[PDB]
């Protein structure tokens, strides 16, 4: 009962599975219901919905 992987190189949002767009030091969610923004902290990206930031 192995967990699904499907190439870990595939880009997909944390929960709102959809295309992601990198911008400078922040990541922007792209897709139909996407639009959330995730800033990089200490060189580490944020994949938490609660910490996700809304469009400026
Ligand atoms: Zn997304």
CA of residue 46 to ligand 1 center, whole Å: 12
How far is the centre of ligand 1, averaged over its atoms, from the C-alpha of 39 (Å)? 13
What SS3 state is found at 25? coil
Map tokens 């992987």 to a residue. 5
Q: Is 13 exposed, middle or buried (0-12, 13-18, 19+ CB in 10 A)?
A: buried
C-alpha R_g of the chain: 12
**Length in residues, the chain:** 56
- b/e map 15-44, b = 16+ CB within 10 Å: ebebebeeeeeebbbeeeeeebbbeeeeee
Ligand 1 centroid to Cα of residue 1, in Å, is 27
CATH class (in words) of the domain with range 18-56: mainly beta
User: How many CB atoms lie under 10 A from the CB of residue 52?
Assistant: 19
Contact 43, 25 (CB under 8 A): no
Report the separation in Å between the CA atom of 52 and the middle of ligand 1, taken as the mean of its atom positions.
10
């Amino acid at each position: 009962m192995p967990l699904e992987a499907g190439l870990l190189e595939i880009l997909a949002c944390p929960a709102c599975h959809a295309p992601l767009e990198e911008r400078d030091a922040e990541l922007i969610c792209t897709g139909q219901d996407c639009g959330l923004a995730y800033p990089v902290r200490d060189g580490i990206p944020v994949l938490l919905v609660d910490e996700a930031r809304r469009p400026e």
